[PDB]
Paper text:
pmcRift Valley fever virus (RVFV) is a mosquito-borne phlebovirus of the Hareavirales order (formerly Bunyavirales) that causes severe disease in humans and livestock. The replication and transcription of RVFV, like other viruses in the Hareavirales order, are mediated by the L protein, a 250 kDa RNA-dependent RNA polymerase (RdRp).
We determined the cryo-EM structure of the RVFV L protein in the apo form at 3.5 Å (L proteinapo), which resolves the RdRp while leaving several peripheral regions flexible. This apo structure aligns closely with the previously resolved RVFV L protein structure (RMSD ≈ 1.05 Å), with positional differences located in the vRNA-binding lobe (secondary binding site and template exit channel) and in segments linked to dynamic domains (ENDO and C-terminal). The most notable difference is an ∼20 residue register shift starting near residue 1451. Both the RVFV AlphaFold prediction and the SFTSV (strain AH12) L protein structure indicate a loop in this region, whereas the prior RVFV model omitted the loop and threaded the sequence into a neighboring helix, producing the ∼20-residue shift. The RVFV L proteinapo shares a similar overall organization with the influenza virus polymerase subunits (PA, PB1, PB2) − and other bunyavirus L proteins, ,, reflecting their common evolutionary origin. The catalytic RdRp domain (resembling the PB1 domain) contains the conserved thumb, finger, and palm subdomains seen in SFTSV , and La Crosse virus (LACV) , L proteins. In the RVFV L proteinapo, the finger subdomain adopts a more open, inactive conformation than the replicating state observed for SFTSV. The ENDO and C-terminal domains are highly flexible and unresolved compared to SFTSV and LACV L proteins. ,, Together, these features show that bunyaviral L proteins depend on RNA-induced conformational flexibility and structural rearrangements. The RVFV L proteinapo structure provided a framework to map resistance mutations selected by EIDD-1931 and 2′-FdC.
Author numbering: 214 to 373, 412 to 1318, 1337 to 1351, 1364 to 1370, 1374 to 1405, 1451 to 1572, 1579 to 1599, 1608 to 1626
Write the structure that this text describes.
């Protein structure tokens, strides 16, 4: 044992338990609890009683649910089920109808609040000259308003960013208060029986005009043809001579389409509004603007609300060509003669982000949906024009639905869309169970806000009725498992491919990754913390003292927990032998040894919440600020502490002085997952880090735990079939179920975690554990200060939500609740887990529960059917945080045995859910039971052999503009998103289309279509084609998303003039990019506690730190990890430079893999693809940098550190080590046997420390060697030829 080990052990022994303070501050913890728990063995009789009761309950529930009482035929049972489903649906609909002040059935509100106009080009520029000389007619208030506007323009009274500053007749629509009242009059809920016929008409209809690309429509975003041509020339110089390839050709064709023109128009509207809102220059005036080179005019007003912007659109009659569609879906307009005008429209500041990215998102969505149904991605628009099959209609329908939901961008619509997943997954339930889709009826939104929601609800109701009437039919022959009767949840048309169906289910995920707040309507978050707290038992007798007979919320059985612990210990003894305890001890010691201050010292966030912020009145003006972990961790390390454990004890003492958690909350405004964030203090962070480290250490030993063994997640299902065939020794039958927990986060008490953790650890860790858990028994959560500011001055009748009423009454002292206090600024809670702050421990608890239920399932099969079947059946677990899955496989030779097996498997599936209660594992309605050859886990679906994923989840994510910083940073993160989507199961051609979308978005970001000056910029950037100036690099279409930004840069430098610039740096100014690019683009004071110091001791960069100052150096290096003017400045770079392979080697250490890919993907010309036949098995494959001959015996870093410092971690022969060193030396010319000579000779230490890259490993899912992957994964409709 090293010095670190012995000193850590000595310190840990120095930590001691203080029972008095813990008992006093934290009620439910006591010496007697743990003493009795460790001493008393579990009550076998009680366990047997509860197991028998669960068996009886499961049998009764199965009999009653499936209507086996009379032994009726399938027909009558299904009729009864349909009757029940209809009754439930009618109940929900009537409950909706019971509301008052319902919106009238005919009061149509357009889902899209924009005109359907489509027009030609006009005079360029942003000037308002075209307004002059227009004779507008009409009498509508907007007609008169725009008449005044044109009169002022003719009189040239418009100021300058043009400001109208109109006078009389400016009121009666703008009284500074009218409009904000008007759009406030849209609070009436929508009836379920509202007329929504026009939505259905628009969605599914003979809509072919949408895809006719002619007439020279307005298209401001088609001015970058030369740039795309140059980009294509990089990879396909021969083809580029002829012209654009297929992908760019169809991209520009889609630009030229009617929908393309409209999408570009709306995107320009979004960008213009986003620019306008930043001005805030009008005293009390209006601001008028004109779109670039078009007859579109926007009359804009921001109000005193500072959260809504009011717009009025106008178009010249002479320029207006026609309308995209005459349906009510779009905002109706008013004729005024020379002009067509619409009414004022209010927009929230959040939607503008969606508006700007409309065109790219829609190109992506349409391409993906066309690809999913079999239409080639690179040739779809024409196919959409000649709609001749159900596939084309379905694709168009889904694209239009994406349009509607994106333009509506309301969360409730997204949840309604996502519910379809669980609605339709019910159709795979095999006998003896029957599908119960109607059980999701309780998940509908409380209120209806839009016509689109009504239409979606009606579609969902029809789908539920249809599914409950008749499940999907199975078809088995010669190992060719298949299903029949599937249909789209929304359109209702038949389907035959799993992938489009799953994509339909997951359509509600359009992650845009907005890392900001969301003040409006966040009470639900707070509500989500309270709903269970009031249900806490008044007595703690069932929180770890005794065993409840009928468990309630938050209660659990001590004896069952101890029995599960004993069973898990027995399993571990069987697996790892008798000395498993000491192995665990060594593992945890090793894990804590490597738990340094540095690894926690990441940006993330921290809460400065102390007692100073308890009273709202004291702090009303000071703005709360979230500190970074960096400063606090650095301050702690400056004291001279190396390991994060070192500062545990003292830190907890501070917490013990506080006696409560000091958590703060954060709501992300992104429309998807991980909205909840529980930011938490430094001392809490260190303690929780220790606890989670030990939890993960203990849990790693269990194979079935996916969290601790991510490889096992993909390993287990694939090997399941092979193991089943080996064991059963013949044809097999598989049953399965996927389950999700109900109120997992706020349903758990904390004592059980401490108990079970102590059962698996030696006594010396006990004080570390019981203390570290007790701090969760009382937690105070801050709220948003603006929320309280609003609440204080809101008086009564705030909102109909009872939670807000209760909070208001408690804050003013009118009412008393245990989760709030008068005049305070926090919610106090005794239970909870704060959304994954205690993550590994929960997984361990789930793991042990599943091991016990596995044993019980073995017993049940042995009992109910035949004694000896345990020797010839397979059972498999999968668990994570809260999602779980159960797999069972048995021989399928005898029909009677097969039926008995199915009955027993259903019984065991119900057993798991029923018994989960005793450990406070509450099953959710989302769980699906007894589905044959169907399995779900983390949204990954396993339809027998096929393994499918919801690729759409990553589509919308690929289109975003976060992280700003440098342009090259933006491009490389775009490449990262491309890698993410392609590894998600998409085809390469679809990836190329997404890259085109990203290209157009990125180019319009610099102002393409916004400012005339962009035309000058194009003139310059073309000459130098440097990404540092914003030039976008299109990857080779055949292998886009695989080679990545490194491939793009390598190809660029290989032949283009760009290399001449890089050699200029080898012989405004900024440093190199992480990708290696010498870019140019266009806190530290607080960390007062270095390059020369690192140079003096490079070993710091090559080993884990053991002292303070080195930790400071490591965090320090972690911290430091105009356009016309700039092109004018570049005129001085006339230095004559040439090629140099050594510079390429320095920039790219992995040249061999890059050229290997190049040898296949370079200059492939046109595309010829042979269509495939039916479906094939999905096979995992290793693709890139798999070889080790060129990648050396071990990593270059290991060899360098062994040579310079003798770390002897290479574990190779001495002569082998010398040979490896010599071959590296001939690889690396400037590498020397000493750090000093190497530093002097090479053309600081950090820059040459990380140049050893060793890129990551990539795996792909082929559908039957890099050539194989590229030929079989370019497109899903076929495979390449000649490769």
């Amino acid at each position: 044992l090293g010095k670190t080990e012995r000193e850590l052990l000595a310190m840990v022994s120095s930590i001691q338990i203080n029972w008095s303070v813990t008992e006093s501050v934290f009620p439910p913890f006591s010496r007697e609890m743990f003493d009795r728990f460790r001493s008393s063995p579990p009550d076998s009789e009680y366990i047997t009683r509860i197991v028998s009761r669960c068996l009886i309950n499961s049998q009764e529930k199965l009999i009653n649910s499936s209507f086996f009482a009379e032994g009726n035929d399938k027909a009558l049972r299904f009729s009864k089920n349909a009757e029940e489903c209809s009754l439930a649906v009618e109940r929900a609909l009537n409950q909706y109808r019971a509301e008052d002040n319902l919106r009238d059935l005919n009061d149509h509100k357009s889902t899209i609040q924009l005109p359907p106009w489509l027009s030609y080009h006009d005079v360029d520029g942003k000037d308002l000259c075209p307004l002059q000389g227009l004779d507008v007619r009409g009498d509508h208030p907007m007609c008169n308003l725009w008449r005044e506007v044109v009169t002022s323009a003719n009189l040239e009274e418009i100021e300058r960013v043009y400001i109208a500053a109109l006078g009389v007749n400016g009121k009666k629509h703008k009284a500074d208060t009218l409009v904000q009242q008007m759009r406030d009059r849209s609070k009436q809920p929508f009836s379920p029986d509202h007329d929504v016929d026009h939505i259905s008409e628009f969605l599914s209809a003979c809509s072919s005009d949408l895809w006719a690309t002619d007439e020279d429509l307005y298209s401001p975003l088609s001015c970058d043809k030369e740039l795309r041509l140059a980009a294509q020339r990089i990879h396909q110089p021969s083809l580029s001579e002829r012209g654009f390839n297929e992908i760019i050709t169809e991209h520009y064709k889609f630009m030229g389409s009617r929908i393309g023109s409209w999408c570009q128009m709306v995107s320009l509207i979004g960008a213009e509004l986003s620019a306008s809102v930043k001005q805030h220059v009008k005293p009390n005036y209006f601001v008028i603007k004109r779109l670039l080179g078009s007859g579109i005019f926007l009359l804009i007003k921001p109000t005193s609300s500072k959260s809504h912007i009011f717009v009025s659109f106008a178009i010249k009659r002479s320029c207006w060509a026609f309308d995209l569609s005459t349906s009510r879906v779009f905002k109706p307009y008013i004729d005024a003669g020379d002009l067509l005008v619409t009414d004022f429209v209010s927009y929230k500041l959040s939607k503008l982000t969606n508006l700007c990215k409309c065109v790219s998102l829609m190109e992506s969505s349409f391409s993906f949906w066309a690809e999913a149904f079999g239409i080639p991605s690179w040739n779809f628009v024409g196919d959409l024009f000649r709609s001749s099959d159900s596939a084309a209609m379905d694709a168009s329908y889904m694209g239009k639905l994406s349009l509607l939901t994106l333009l509506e961008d309301k969360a409730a619509t997204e949840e309604l869309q996502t519910i379809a997943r669980y609605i339709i997954m019910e159709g795979f339930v095999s006998p003896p169970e029957i599908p119960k889709p109607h059980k999701m009826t309780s998940k509908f939104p409380k209120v209806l806000r839009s016509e689109l929601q009504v239409y979606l609800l009606n579609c969902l109701c029809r789908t539920i009725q249809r599914i409950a009437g008749e499940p999907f039919i199975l078809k088995k022959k010669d190992g060719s498992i298949s299903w029949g009767g599937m249909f789209n949840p929304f359109s209702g048309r038949p389907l035959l491919d799993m992938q489009p169906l799953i994509s339909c289910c997951y359509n509600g995920y359009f992650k845009n990754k907005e890392e900001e707040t969301e003040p409006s309507s966040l009470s639900g978050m707070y509500k989500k913390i309270i709903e269970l707290e009031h249900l806490r038992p008044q007595s703690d007798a069932f929180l770890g003292y005794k065993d409840p007979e009928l468990p309630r919320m938050h209660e659990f059985s001590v004896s069952y927990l101890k029995e599960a612990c004993n069973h898990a210990k027995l399993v571990l003894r069987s697996l790892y032998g008798q000395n498993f305890m000491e192995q665990i001890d060594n593992q945890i010691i090793r894990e804590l040894s490597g738990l340094t201050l540095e690894r926690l010292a990441t940006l993330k966030a921290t809460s400065n919440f102390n007692e100073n912020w308890y009273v709202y009145k004291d702090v009303a003006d000071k703005n709360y600020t979230r500190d970074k972990l960096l400063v606090k961790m650095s301050k702690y390390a400056s004291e001279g502490k190396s390991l994060a454990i070192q500062k545990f004890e003292d830190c907890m003492r501070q917490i013990e002085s506080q006696g409560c958690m000091h958590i703060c909350l954060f709501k992300k405004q992104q429309h998807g997952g991980l909205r909840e964030i529980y930011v938490m203090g430094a001392e809490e962070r260190i303690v929780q880090s220790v606890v989670e480290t030990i939890a993960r250490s203990i849990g790693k030993f269990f194979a079935s735990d996916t969290l601790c063994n991510p490889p096992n997640k993909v390993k287990i299902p694939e090997t399941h079939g092979i193991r089943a065939r080996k064991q059963c020794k013949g044809p097999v039958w598989t049953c399965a179920t996927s389950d999700d927990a109900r109120k997992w986060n706020q349903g758990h008490f904390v004592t059980k975690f401490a108990l079970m953790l102590c059962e698996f650890t030696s006594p010396k860790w006990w004080p570390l554990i019981i203390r570290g858990c007790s701090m969760f028994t009382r937690k105070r959560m801050m709220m948003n200060l603006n929320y309280l500011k609003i609440l204080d001055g809101h008086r009564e009748l705030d909102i109909r939500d009872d939670f807000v009423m209760d909070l208001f009454k408690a804050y003013h002292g009118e009412a008393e609740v245990p989760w709030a206090f008068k005049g305070k600024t926090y919610l106090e809670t005794t239970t909870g887990m704060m959304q994954g702050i205690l993550h590994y421990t929960s997984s361990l608890l789930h793991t042990i529960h599943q091991e016990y239920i596995r044993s019980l399932s073995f017993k049940i099969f042995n009992l109910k059917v035949a004694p000896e079947m345990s020797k010839s059946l397979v059972c498999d677990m999968m668990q994570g945080s809260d999602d779980s899955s159960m797999l069972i496989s048995f021989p399928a030779d005898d029909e009677k045995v097969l039926t008995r097996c199915k009955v027993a498997a259903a019984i065991c599936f119900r057993m798991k859910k029923e018994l989960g209660v005793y450990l406070a594992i509450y099953p959710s309605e989302k769980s699906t039971a007894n589905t044959d050859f169907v399995m779900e886990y983390n949204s990954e679906f396993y339809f027998h052999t096929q393994h499918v994923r919801p690729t759409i989840r990553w589509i919308a994510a690929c289109c975003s503009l976060p992280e700003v910083e440098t342009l090259v940073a933006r491009q490389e993160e775009a490449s990262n998103l491309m890698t993410s989507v392609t590894e998600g199961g998409g085809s390469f051609s679809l990836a190329a289309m997404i890259q085109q979308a990203q290209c157009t978005l990125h180019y319009m970001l610099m102002g393409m279509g916004v400012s005339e000056l962009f035309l000058e910029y194009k003139k310059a950037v073309l000459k130098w084609n440097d990404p540092g100036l914003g030039f976008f690099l299109l990857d080779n279409p055949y292998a886009c998303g695989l080679g990545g930004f490194r491939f793009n840069l390598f190809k660029a430098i290989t032949r283009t003039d760009l290399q001449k610039l890089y050699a200029f740096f080898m012989k405004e100014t900024c440093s190199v990019s992480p990708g290696g690019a010498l870019i140019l683009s266009s806190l530290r004071d607080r960390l007062n506690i270095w390059i020369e110091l690192i140079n003096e001791n490079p070993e710091v960069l090559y080993r884990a730190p053991r002292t303070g100052p080195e930790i400071l150096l490591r965090i320090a290096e972690k911290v430091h990890s105009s356009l016309l003017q700039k092109m004018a400045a570049y005129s001085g770079f006339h230095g004559f430079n040439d090629m140099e392979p050594e510079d390429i080697l320095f920039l790219f250490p992995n040249i061999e893999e890059l050229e290997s890919l190049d040898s296949i993907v370079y200059n492939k010309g046109e595309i010829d693809i042979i269509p495939r036949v039916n479906i094939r098995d999905a096979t995992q494959t290793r693709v890139t940098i798999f070889n080790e001959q060129k990648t050396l015996r071990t990593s270059p870093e290991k060899l360098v550190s062994d040579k310079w410092f003798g770390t002897q971690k290479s574990r190779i022969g001495k002569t082998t080590f010398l040979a490896e060193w010599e071959k590296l030396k001939k690889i690396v010319k400037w590498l020397e046997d000493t750090p000093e000579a190497t530093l002097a000779h090479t053309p600081v230490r950090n820059f040459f420390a990380r140049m050893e890259s060793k890129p990551r490993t990539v795996r792909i899912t082929g559908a039957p060697k890099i050539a194989m992957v590229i030929r079989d994964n370019f497109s899903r409709m076929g495979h390449l030829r000649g490769v």
